[PDB]
PDB file of C-alpha atoms in Angstrom:
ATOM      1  CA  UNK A   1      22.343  -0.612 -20.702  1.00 40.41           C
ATOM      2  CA  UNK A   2      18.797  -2.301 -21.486  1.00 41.65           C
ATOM      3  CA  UNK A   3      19.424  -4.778 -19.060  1.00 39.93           C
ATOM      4  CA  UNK A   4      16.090  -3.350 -16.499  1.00 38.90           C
ATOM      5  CA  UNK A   5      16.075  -6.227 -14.541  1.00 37.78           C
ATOM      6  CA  UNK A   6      15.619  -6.262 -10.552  1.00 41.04           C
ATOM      7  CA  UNK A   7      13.492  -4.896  -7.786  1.00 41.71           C
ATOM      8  CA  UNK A   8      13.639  -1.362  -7.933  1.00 40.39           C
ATOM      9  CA  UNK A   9      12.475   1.352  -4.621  1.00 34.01           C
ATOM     10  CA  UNK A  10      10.586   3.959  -5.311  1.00 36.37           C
ATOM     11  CA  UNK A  11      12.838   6.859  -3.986  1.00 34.28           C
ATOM     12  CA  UNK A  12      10.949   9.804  -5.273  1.00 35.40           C
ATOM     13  CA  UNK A  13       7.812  10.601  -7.306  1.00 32.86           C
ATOM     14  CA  UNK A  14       6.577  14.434  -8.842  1.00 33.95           C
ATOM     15  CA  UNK A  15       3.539  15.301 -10.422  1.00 31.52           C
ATOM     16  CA  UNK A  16       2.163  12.623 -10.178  1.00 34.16           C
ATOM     17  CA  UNK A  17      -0.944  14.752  -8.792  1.00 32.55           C
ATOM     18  CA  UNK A  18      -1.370  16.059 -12.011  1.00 32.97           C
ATOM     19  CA  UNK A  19      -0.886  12.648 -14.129  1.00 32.44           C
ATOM     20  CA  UNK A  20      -3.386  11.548 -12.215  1.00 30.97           C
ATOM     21  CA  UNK A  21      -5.637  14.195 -12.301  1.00 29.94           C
ATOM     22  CA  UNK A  22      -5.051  14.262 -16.025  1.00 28.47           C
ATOM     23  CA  UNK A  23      -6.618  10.922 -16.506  1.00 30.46           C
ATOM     24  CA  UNK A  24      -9.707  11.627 -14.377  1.00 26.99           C
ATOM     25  CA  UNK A  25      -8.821   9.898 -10.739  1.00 27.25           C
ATOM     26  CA  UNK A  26     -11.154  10.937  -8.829  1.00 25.64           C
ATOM     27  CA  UNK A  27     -10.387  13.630  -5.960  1.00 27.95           C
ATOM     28  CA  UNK A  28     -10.523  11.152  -3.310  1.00 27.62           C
ATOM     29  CA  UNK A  29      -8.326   7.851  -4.785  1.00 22.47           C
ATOM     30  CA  UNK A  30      -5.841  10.901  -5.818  1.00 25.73           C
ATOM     31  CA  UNK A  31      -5.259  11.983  -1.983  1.00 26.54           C
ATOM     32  CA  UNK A  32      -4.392   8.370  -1.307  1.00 25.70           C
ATOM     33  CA  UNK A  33      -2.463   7.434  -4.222  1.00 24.74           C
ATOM     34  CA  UNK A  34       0.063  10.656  -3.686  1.00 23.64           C
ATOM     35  CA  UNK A  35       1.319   8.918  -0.213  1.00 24.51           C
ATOM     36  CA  UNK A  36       1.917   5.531  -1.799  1.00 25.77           C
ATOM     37  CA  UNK A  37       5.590   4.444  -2.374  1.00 25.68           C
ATOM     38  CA  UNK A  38       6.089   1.546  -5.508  1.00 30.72           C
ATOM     39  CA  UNK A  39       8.252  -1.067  -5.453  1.00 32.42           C
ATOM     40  CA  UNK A  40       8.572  -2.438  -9.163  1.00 32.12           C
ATOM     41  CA  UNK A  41       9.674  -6.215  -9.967  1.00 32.02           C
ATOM     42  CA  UNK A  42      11.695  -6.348 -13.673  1.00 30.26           C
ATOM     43  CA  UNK A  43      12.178 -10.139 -14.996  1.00 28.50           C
ATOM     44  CA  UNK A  44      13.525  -9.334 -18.483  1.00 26.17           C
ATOM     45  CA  UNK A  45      14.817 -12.018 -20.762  1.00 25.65           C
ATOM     46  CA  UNK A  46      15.954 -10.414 -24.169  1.00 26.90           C
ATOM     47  CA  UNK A  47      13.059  -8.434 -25.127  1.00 26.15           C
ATOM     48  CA  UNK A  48       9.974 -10.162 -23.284  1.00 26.32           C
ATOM     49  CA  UNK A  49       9.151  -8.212 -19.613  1.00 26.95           C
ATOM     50  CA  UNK A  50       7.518  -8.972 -17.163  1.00 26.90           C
ATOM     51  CA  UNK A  51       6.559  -6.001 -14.825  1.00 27.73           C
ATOM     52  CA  UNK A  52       5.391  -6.403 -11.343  1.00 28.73           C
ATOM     53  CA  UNK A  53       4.456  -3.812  -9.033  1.00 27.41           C
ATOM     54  CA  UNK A  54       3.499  -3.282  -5.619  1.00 29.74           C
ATOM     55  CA  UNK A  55       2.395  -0.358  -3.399  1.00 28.94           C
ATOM     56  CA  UNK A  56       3.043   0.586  -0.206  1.00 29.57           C
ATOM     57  CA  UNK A  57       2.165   3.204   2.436  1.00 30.62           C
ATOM     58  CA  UNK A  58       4.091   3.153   6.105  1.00 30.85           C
ATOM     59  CA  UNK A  59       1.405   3.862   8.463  1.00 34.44           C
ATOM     60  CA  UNK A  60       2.169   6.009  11.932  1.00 34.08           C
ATOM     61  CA  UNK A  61       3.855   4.153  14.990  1.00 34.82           C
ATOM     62  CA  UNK A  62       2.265   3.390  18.000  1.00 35.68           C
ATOM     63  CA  UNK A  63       4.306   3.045  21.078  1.00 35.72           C
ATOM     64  CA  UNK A  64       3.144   2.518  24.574  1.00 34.94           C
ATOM     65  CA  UNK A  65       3.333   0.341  27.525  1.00 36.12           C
ATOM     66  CA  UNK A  66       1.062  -2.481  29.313  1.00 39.30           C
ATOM     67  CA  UNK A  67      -0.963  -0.756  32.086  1.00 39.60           C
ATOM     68  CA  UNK A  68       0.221   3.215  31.287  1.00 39.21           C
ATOM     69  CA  UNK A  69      -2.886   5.050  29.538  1.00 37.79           C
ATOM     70  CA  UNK A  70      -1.408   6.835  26.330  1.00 35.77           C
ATOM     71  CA  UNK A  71      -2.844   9.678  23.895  1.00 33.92           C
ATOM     72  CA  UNK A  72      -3.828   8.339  20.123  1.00 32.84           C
ATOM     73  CA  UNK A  73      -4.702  10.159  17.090  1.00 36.30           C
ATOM     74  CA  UNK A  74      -5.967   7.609  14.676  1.00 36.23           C
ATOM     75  CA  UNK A  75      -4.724   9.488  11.881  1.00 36.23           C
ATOM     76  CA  UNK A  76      -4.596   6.221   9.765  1.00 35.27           C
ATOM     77  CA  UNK A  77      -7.616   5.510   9.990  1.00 33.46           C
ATOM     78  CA  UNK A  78     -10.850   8.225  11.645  1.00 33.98           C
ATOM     79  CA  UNK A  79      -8.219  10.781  12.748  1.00 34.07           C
ATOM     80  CA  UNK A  80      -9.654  10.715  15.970  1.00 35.11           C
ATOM     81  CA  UNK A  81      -8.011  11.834  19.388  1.00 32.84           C
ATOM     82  CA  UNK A  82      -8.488   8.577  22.032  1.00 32.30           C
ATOM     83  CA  UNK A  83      -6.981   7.401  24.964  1.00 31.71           C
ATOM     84  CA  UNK A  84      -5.912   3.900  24.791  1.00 29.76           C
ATOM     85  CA  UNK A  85      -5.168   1.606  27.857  1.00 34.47           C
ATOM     86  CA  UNK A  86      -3.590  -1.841  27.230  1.00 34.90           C
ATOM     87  CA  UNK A  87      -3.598  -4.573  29.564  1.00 37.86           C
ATOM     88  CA  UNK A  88      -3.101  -8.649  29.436  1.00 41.12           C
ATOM     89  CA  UNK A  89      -5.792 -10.664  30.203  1.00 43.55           C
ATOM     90  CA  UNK A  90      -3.790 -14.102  30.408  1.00 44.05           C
ATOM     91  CA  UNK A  91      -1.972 -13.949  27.245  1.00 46.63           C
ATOM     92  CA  UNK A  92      -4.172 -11.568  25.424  1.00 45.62           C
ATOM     93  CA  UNK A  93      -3.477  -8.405  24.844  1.00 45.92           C
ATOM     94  CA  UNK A  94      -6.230  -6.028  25.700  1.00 45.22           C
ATOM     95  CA  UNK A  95      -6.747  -2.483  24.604  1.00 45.25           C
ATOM     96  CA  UNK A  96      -9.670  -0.059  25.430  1.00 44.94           C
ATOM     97  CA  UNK A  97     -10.150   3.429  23.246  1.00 45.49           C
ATOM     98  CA  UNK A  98     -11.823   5.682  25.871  1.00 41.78           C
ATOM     99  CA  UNK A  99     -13.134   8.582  23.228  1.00 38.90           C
ATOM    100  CA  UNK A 100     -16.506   9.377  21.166  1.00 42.06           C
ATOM    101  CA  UNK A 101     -16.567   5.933  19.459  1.00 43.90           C
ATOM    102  CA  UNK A 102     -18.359   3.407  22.576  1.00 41.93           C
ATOM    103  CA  UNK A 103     -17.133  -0.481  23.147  1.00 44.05           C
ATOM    104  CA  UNK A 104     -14.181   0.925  21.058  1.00 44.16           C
ATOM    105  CA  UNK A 105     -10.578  -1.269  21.179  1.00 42.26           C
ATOM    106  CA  UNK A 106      -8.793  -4.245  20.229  1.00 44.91           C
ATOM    107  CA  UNK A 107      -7.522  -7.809  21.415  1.00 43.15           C
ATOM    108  CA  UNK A 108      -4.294  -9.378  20.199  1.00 42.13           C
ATOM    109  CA  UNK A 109      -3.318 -12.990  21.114  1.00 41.92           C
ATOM    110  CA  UNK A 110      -0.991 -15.812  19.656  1.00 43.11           C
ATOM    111  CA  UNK A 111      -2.094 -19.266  18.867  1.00 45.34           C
ATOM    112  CA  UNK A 112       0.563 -21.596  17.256  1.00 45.60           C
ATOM    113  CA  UNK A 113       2.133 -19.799  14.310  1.00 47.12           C
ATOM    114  CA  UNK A 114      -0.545 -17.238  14.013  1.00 46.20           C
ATOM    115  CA  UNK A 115      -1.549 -14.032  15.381  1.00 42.76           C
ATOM    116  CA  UNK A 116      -5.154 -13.296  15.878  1.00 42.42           C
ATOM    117  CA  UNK A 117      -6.583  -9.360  16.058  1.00 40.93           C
ATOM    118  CA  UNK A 118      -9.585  -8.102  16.736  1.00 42.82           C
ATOM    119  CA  UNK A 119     -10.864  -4.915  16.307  1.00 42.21           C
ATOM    120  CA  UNK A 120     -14.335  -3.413  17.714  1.00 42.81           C
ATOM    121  CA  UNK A 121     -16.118  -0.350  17.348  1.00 44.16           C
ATOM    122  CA  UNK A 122     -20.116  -0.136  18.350  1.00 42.35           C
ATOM    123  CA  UNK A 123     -21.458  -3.193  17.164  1.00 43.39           C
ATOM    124  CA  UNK A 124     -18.672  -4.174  14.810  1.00 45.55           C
ATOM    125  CA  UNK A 125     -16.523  -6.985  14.687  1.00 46.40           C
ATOM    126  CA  UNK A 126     -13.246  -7.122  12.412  1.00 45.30           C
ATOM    127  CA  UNK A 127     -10.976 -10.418  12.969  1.00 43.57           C
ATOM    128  CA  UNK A 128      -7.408 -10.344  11.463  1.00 45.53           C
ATOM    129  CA  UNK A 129      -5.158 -13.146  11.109  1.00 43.45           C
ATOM    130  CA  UNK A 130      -1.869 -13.190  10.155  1.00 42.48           C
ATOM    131  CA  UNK A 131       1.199 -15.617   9.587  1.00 41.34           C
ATOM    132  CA  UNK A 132       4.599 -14.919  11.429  1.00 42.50           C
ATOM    133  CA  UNK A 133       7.606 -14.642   9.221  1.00 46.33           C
TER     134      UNK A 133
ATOM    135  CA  UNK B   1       2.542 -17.044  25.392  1.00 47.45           C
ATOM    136  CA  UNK B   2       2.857 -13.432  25.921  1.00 44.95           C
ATOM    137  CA  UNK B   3       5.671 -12.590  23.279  1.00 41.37           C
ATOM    138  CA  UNK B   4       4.175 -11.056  20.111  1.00 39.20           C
ATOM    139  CA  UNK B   5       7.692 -10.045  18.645  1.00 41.80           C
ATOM    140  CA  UNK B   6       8.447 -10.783  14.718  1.00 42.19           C
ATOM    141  CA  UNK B   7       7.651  -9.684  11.423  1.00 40.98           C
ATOM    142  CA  UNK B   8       3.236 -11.066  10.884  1.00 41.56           C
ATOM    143  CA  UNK B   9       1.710 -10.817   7.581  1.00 44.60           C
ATOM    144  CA  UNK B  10      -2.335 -10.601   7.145  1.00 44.62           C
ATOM    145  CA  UNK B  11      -3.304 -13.669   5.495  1.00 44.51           C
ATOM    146  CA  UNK B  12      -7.179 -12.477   6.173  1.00 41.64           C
ATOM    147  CA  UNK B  13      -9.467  -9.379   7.188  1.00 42.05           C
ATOM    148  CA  UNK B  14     -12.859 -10.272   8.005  1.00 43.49           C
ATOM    149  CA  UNK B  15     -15.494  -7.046   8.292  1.00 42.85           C
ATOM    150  CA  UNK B  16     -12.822  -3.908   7.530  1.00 43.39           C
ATOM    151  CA  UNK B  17     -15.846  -2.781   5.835  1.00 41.10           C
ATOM    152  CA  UNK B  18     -18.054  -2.488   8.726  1.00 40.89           C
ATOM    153  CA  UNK B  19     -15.331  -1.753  11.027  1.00 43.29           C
ATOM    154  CA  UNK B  20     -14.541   1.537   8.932  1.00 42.82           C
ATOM    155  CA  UNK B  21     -18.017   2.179   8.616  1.00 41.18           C
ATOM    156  CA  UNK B  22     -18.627   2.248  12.243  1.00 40.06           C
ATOM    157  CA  UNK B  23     -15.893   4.726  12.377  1.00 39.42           C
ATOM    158  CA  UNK B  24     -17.264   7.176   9.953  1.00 38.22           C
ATOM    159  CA  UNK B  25     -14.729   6.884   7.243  1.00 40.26           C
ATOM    160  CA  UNK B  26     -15.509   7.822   3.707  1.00 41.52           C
ATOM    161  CA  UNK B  27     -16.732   5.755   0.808  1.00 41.69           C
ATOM    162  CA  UNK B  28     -13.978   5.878  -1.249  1.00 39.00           C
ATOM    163  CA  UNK B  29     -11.500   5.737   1.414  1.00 41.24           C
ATOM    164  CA  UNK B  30     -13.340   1.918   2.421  1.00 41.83           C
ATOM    165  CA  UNK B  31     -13.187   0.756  -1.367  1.00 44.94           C
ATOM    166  CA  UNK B  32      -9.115   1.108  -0.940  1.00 47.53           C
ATOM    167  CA  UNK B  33      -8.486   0.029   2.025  1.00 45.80           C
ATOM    168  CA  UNK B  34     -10.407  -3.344   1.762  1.00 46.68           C
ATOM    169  CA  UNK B  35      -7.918  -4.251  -0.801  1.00 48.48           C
ATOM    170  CA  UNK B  36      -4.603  -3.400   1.248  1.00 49.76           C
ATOM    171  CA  UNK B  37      -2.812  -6.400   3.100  1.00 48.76           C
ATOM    172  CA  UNK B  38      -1.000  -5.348   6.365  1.00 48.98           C
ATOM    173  CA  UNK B  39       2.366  -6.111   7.525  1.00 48.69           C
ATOM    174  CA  UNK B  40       2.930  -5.543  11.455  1.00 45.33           C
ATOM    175  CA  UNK B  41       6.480  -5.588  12.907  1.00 43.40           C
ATOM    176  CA  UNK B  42       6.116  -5.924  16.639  1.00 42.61           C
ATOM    177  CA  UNK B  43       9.826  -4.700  18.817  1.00 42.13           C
ATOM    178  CA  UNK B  44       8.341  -6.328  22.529  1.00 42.98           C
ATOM    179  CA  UNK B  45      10.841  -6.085  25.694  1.00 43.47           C
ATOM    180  CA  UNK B  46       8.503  -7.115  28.341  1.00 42.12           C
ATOM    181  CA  UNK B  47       5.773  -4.937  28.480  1.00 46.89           C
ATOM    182  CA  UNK B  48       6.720  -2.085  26.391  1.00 46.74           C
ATOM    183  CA  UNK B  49       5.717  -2.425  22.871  1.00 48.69           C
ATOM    184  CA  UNK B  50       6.599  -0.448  19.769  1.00 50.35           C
ATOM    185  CA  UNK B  51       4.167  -1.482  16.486  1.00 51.16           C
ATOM    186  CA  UNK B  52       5.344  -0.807  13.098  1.00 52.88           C
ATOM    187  CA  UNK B  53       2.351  -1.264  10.538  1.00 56.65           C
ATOM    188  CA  UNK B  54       2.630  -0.927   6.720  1.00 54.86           C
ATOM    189  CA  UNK B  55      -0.145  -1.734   4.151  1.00 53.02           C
ATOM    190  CA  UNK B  56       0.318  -3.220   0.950  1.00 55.94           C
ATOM    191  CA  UNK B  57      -1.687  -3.502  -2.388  1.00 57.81           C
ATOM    192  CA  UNK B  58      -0.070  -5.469  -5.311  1.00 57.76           C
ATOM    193  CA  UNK B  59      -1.040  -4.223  -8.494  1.00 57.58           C
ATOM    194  CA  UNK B  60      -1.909  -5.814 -11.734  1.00 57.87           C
ATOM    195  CA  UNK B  61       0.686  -7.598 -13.709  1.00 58.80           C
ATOM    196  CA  UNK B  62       2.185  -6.347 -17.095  1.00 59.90           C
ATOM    197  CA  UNK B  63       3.650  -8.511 -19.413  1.00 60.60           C
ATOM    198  CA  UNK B  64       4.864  -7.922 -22.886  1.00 62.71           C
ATOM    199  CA  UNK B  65       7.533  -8.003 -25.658  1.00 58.84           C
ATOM    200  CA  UNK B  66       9.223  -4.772 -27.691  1.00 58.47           C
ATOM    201  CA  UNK B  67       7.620  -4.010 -30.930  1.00 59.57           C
ATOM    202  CA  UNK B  68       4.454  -6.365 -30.327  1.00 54.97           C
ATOM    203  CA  UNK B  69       1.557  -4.032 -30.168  1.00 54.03           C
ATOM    204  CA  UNK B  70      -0.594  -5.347 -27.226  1.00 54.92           C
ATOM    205  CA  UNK B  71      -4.017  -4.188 -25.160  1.00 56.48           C
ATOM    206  CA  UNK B  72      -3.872  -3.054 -21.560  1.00 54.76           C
ATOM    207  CA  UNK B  73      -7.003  -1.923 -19.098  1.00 53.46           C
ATOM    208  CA  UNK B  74      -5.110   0.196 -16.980  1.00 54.33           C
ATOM    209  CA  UNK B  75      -7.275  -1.210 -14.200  1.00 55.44           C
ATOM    210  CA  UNK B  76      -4.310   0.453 -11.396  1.00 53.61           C
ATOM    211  CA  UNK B  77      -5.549   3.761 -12.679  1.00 58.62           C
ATOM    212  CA  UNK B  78      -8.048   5.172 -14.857  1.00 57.76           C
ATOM    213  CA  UNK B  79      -9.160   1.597 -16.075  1.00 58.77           C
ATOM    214  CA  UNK B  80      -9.102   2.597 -19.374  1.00 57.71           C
ATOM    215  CA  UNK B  81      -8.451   0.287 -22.939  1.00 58.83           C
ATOM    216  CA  UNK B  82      -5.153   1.152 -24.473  1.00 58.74           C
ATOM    217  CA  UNK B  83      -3.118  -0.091 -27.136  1.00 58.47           C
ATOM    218  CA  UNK B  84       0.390  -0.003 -26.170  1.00 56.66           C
ATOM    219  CA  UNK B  85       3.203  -0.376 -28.291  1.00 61.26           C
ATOM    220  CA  UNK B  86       6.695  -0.813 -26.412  1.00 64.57           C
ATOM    221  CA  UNK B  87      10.028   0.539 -28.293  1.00 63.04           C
ATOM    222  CA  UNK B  88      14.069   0.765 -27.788  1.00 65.34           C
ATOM    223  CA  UNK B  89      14.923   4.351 -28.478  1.00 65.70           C
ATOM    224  CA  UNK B  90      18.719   3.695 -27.774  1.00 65.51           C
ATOM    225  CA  UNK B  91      18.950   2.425 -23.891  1.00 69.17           C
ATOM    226  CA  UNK B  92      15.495   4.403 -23.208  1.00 71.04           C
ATOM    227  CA  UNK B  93      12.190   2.122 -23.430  1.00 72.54           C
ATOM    228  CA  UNK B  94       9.333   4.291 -25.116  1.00 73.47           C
ATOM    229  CA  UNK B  95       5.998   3.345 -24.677  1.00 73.83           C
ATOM    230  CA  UNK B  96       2.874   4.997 -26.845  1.00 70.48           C
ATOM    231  CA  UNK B  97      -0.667   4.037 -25.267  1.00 69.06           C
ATOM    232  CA  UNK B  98      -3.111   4.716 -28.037  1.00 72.51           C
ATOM    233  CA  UNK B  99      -6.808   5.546 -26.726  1.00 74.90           C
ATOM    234  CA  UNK B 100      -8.793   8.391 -25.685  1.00 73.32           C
ATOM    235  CA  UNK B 101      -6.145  10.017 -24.060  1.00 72.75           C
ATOM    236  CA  UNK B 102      -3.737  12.103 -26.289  1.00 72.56           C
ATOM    237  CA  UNK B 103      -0.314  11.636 -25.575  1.00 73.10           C
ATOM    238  CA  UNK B 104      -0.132   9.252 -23.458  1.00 73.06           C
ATOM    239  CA  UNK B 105       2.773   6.892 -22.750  1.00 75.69           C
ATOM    240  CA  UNK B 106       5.962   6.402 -20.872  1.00 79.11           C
ATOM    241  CA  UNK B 107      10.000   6.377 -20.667  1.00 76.94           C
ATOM    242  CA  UNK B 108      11.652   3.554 -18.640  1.00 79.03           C
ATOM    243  CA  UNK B 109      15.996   4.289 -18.694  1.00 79.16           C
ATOM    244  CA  UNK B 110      18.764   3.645 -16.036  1.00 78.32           C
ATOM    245  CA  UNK B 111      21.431   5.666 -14.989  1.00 79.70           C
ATOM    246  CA  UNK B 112      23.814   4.139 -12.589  1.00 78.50           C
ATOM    247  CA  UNK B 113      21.854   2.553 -10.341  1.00 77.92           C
ATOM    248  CA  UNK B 114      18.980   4.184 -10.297  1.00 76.57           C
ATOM    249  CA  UNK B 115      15.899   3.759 -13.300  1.00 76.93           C
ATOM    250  CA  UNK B 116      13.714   6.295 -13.871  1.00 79.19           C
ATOM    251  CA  UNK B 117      10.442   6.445 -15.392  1.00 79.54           C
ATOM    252  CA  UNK B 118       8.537   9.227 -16.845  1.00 78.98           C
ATOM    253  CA  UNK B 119       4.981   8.956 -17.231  1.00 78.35           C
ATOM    254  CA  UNK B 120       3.200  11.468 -19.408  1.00 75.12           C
ATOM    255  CA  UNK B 121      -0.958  12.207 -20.340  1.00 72.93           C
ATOM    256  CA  UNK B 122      -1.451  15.371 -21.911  1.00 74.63           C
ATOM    257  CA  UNK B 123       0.305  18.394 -21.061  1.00 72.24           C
ATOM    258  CA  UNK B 124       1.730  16.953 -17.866  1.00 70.65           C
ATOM    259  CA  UNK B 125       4.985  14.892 -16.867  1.00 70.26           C
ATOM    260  CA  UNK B 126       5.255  12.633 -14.077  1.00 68.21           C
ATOM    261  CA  UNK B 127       8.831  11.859 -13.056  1.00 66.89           C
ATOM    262  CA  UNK B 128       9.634   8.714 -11.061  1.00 66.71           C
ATOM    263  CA  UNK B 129      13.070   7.788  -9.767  1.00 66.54           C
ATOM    264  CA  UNK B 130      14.031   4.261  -8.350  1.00 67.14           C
ATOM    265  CA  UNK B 131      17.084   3.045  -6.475  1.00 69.40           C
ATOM    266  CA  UNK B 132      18.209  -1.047  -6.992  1.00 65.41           C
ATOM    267  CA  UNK B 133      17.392  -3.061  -4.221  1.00 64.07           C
TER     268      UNK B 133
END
């Protein structure tokens, strides 16, 4: 069949280190790229394609609970070893990261259809939005 | 409201750069992950939360039709100008990317319902399986 149409999961990928590597990625994009997981989008009509692709990395899960101090390894991000506390301040959700890093943590709060982050680290600001779906 | 359950989807990141930097993460690391879009997955009861983050980049778009010879900057990869040339060999479609690098192409064929792709660049072989969503 050379019918290729769909969207098609990426269930498993080898060598791709060394395809990579064979077209001069550097070291760094190559550590990266080996944990991604593609997702590719065929519209085919006869013999004209259309390819679109997407990739993806899951990043760790973080579990905990309002008012319990928990242990975090930011391994998605500095791989460093903090311990978070989360608390509401009205209907924000407030989270200190006691470690090395000072005035480190995030705030979380709804407004309409949107959800608003913040994340903080010395004298750093990052603001997130996103839609609900 | 307190509830942050649902499936949220950045629609903007403001400062990831400086963020990251603050937290001692690499240079090349930073030039990635300011192009990623997050989606968080929030599973609330009350006040125990479990957060389920995955980050996204969508990659550049390919369109063409078999046997018309057309030019692609692999700007996903290596960003390199090829000339690629896209061919039925039975069921199995063979691409040839003419440019610097010798040997260099691809194999797109299904089998069941799964298609696999095999990229190649010199000596090496990258095999890629995908399931139908």
């Amino acid at each position: 069949t050379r019918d290729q149409n769909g969207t098609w999961e990426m269930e498993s990928n080898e060598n791709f280190e060394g395809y990579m590597k064979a077209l001069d990625i550097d070291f760094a994009t190559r550590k990266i790229a080996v944990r991604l997981t593609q997702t590719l989008v065929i519209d085919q009509d006869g013999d004209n394609f259309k390819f679109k692709t997407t990739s993806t990395f899951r990043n760790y899960d973080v579990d905990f609970t309002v008012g319990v101090e928990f242990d975090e390894y930011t391994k998605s991000l500095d791989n460093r070893h903090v311990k978070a506390l989360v608390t509401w301040e009205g209907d924000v959700l407030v989270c200190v990261q006691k470690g090395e890093k000072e005035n480190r943590g995030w705030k979380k709060w709804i407004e309409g259809d949107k959800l608003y982050l913040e994340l903080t680290c010395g004298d750093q600001v990052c603001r997130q939005v996103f839609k609900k779906k």
